[PDB]
């Protein structure tokens, strides 16, 4: 599982990744961007794609130039 | 002036651009039953523990509203999967979309008019009353709107049914005119004028906005008013000696304190339930408005619309979407007839015992001749066998006149 | 009215609504739809009906060669409505 | 000392009150020119008496 | 008497929302059937309009 402490500064603690949604604990941060699997918030989603949990930034879609 | 042999055709046409505003969602909140009702005391929590499962029921309702908000935003905007980009070359036959395209200089990729709309709703945590972030950041919505604009200008409607097909802009406008019953050559022979009209109209919108957004303001005002009432309601006695549970932790022992703690509990439950109910009704209303906004998005913008007064007053030509805080804005580009002239008419012309009718136009006469013209634009043409069609004998039609049809075959036979 | 329970008048008196409806009727009969997009353009009534037929895929000469019959049909139908009403309004009653 | 429930109620009721006027305005006020029919009644045999 | 007043107000709010929906639909009929000819089936009576 992963845990989310909403509204709390990550530095204050009762793998840590500070999202605007709140200090996220237990998951890893990557640099890719895929479809959104489950919504965390504030433009950040997460998934069990790779096995551990990852939290990534959702990407709207593939790109083309007519 | 209605007379049984008179009609009034326009001569000139005027473009126009009109704005429209819609709300799409509200600001999501979540509340703590225990923190609001009891503060922090153990005794109050112990006494509430037996009232029921009202707290849990409330939380379920509030989270339901929360998730519908994300669905509303998703539905209104996420209708395209390819994030198109405009080409650096800007040649659209004289049209000028500088204003409502993305300007790559500002940090937030917002167009000029989007930026103006943003700076008009200035909006006017310590009790268990939390607000939560939306799912999509504003840059994402900006990207979606930019993609829609690129799609319409470079591909017409054809991106909304399948793969994005390119086509110049002049012929897209020509097709859109043909779709309201005005032939193509009308557009072609006047392109410079339509271009100037459109530029001036968009400039006037840009000016008028920087003066208007009541519909998007009332939502914020209602939200803030409700929260202020729900918070201010914590300073009434509801029939106790005081309105602070710390004023009751002291100066009393449990046996006779519990009755006043009871009265405070009752008051604060009743306040919470009123807040939740009114919120549910408001959310349903916004849900209705968001469904309507998605429908406009999918009918006016994705393709041309034809149902009257659905995408602005006047015959509809196209639309452009723009964003705004917690809402969407439409710019409907539409068409209007300007300068009228009176002409005399007649249903059919009997050349030689045969009733000739117009294929798609209507017969007009400036007093000296007969021409046949299209319905919405005065453009005379001469009667031929390639322009009418026959039926019966000219004896049953209530209105008939006498004229000869040119029939361009006889002279050529030599 | 004697307990703090007040009713209030609407904004528009019924004559005003009557005027609005009369205006709409005048617009449709004397100008077709063209008053709903811009200036009111006049056009006889026979050709307005002809255009409305053409808009559902029935050519114009169909209307023209039978105008007296459409007129009688319409009169009889409106008379039957006038009779049937004077007999029905549950939706407005509830 | 019960609270501001009265004021809250009054605000709700007045909200309904103003929406009523907006509904009537929207359904009917769609024309700005108050046209008049001509005294001549010749519509090809139709009869709008 | 507080409890009675609140029940009355709530039911009134729900009814008003329903009438609001009906009035939007009526305005749409007014603006599509009357102002111009309509073409979407079964929106302005049974049969071609
Ligand atoms: C249709 O209306 C437009 C709007 O006035 C006319 O355009 C003007 O034409 C005059 C004379 O050609 C110019 O001096 C003006 O500068 C034009 N307007 C603008 C904004 O530039 C147009 O001429 C009209 N159509 C016809 C056939 O006369
Ligand atoms: C109605 O339009 C016709 C066509 O333009 C006018 O007839 C022309 O008039 C000019 C000026 O006298 C002549 O030079 C042309 O040779 C005429 N052409 C034809 C085919 O007749 C006519 O004068 C117009 N009538 C009115 C009352 O304006
Ligand atoms: C169109 O021309 C025809 C051919 O002359 C007209 O038909 C005759 O009109 C006169 C008018 O007095 C009648 O007396 C004749 O009985 C008609 N029939 C024939 C076979 O000559 C017709 O009336 C003209 N239409 C008009 C003037 O509106
Ligand atoms: C969290 O605390 C650090 C200092 O410990 C501070 O620099 C940072 O701005 C804080 N962030 C938030 C969101 O409070
Ligand atoms: C992700 O990007 C940041 C900065 O671009 C970099 O420091 C980091 O090493 C990158 N991580 C991976 C896994 O690529
Ligand atoms: C378009 O409008 C902008 C804004 O006034 C102007 O700077 C520009 O020169 C116009 N023309 C083109 C081709 O961009
Ligand atoms: C046509 O002429 C009549 C003359 O009485 C006038 O009343 C009417 O306004 C005119 N209409 C147009 C469109 O020129
Ligand atoms: C049109 O009305 C006039 C009355 O001014 C009448 O003389 C004429 O016969 C009418 N024509 C038709 C076709 O009804
Ligand atoms: C129209 O109907 C009315 C009502 O029966 C009748 O009095 C009148 O004669 C009819 N015809 C005309 C032209 O008004």
Author numbering:
A (entry chain A): 608 to 621, 641 to 676, 690 to 705
B (entry chain B): 706 to 829, 854 to 940, 944 to 1146
C (entry chain C): 854 to 940, 944 to 950
D (entry chain C): 755 to 803
E (entry chain C): 1000 to 1048
Paper text:
The spike glycoproteins of coronaviruses are responsible for receptor binding and membrane fusion during the initial stages of virus infection. The spike proteins of most current severe acute respiratory syndrome coronavirus 2 isolates contain a D614G substitution, by comparison with the spike protein of initial isolates. Viruses that have spike proteins containing the amino acid substitution D614G are currently predominant in the severe acute respiratory syndrome coronavirus 2 (SARS-CoV-2) pandemic, and it has recently been shown that G614 viruses have higher infectivity and produce higher viral loads than D614 viruses. In this study we present high-resolution, single-particle cryo-electron microscopy structures of the G614 spike variant showing that it adopts a predominantly open conformation, unlike the D614 spike that is mostly closed.
